[PDB]
Structure 1
Amino acid sequence: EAEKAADESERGMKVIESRAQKDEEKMEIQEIQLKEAKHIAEDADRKYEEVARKLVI
């Protein structure tokens, strides 16, 4: 049973590390799209601030 548990541990660590690298790629791409989303949000924010100042003046 020690050897059986060792084999269980080996394919378990294989599958969890595969899922882990998948998760790393996923978190990286969503962090990137977080950067673009924040950039677009702030862009729209100050663009509308400027146009509203122009409207009031």
Structure 2
Amino acid sequence: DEEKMEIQEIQLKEAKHIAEDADRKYEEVARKLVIIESDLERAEERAEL
């Protein structure tokens, strides 16, 4: 039962690491999207002119 224990909390640390890293990889995308969207509006006005 102690073997089963150790397997369980090592899997818990690994899962928490993955969940922590995923949100950072997510939050970079928001500022990247905002910047590229501003550039897209800029190019649209260029073309209309």
Q: Which 5+ residue runs of structure 1 have no aligned equivalent? A: 1-5
Of the three residues 10, 19, 43, the one matched with 2:5 is 10
C-alpha root-mean-square deviation of aligned residues, in Å?
A: 1.2
TM-score (norm 2): 0.79
| Greater than 3 Å deviation, 4+ residue runs | none
Shift of 1:34: 1.4
Shift of 1:51: 2.1
Within 5 Å, give how 1:1-57 maps onto structure 2: 6-54=1-49
Greater displacement, 36-45 / 18-27: 36-45
Structure showing greater Rg: 1
**Percent of pairs identical after alignment?**
16
Number of residue-to-residue matches in the alignment: 49
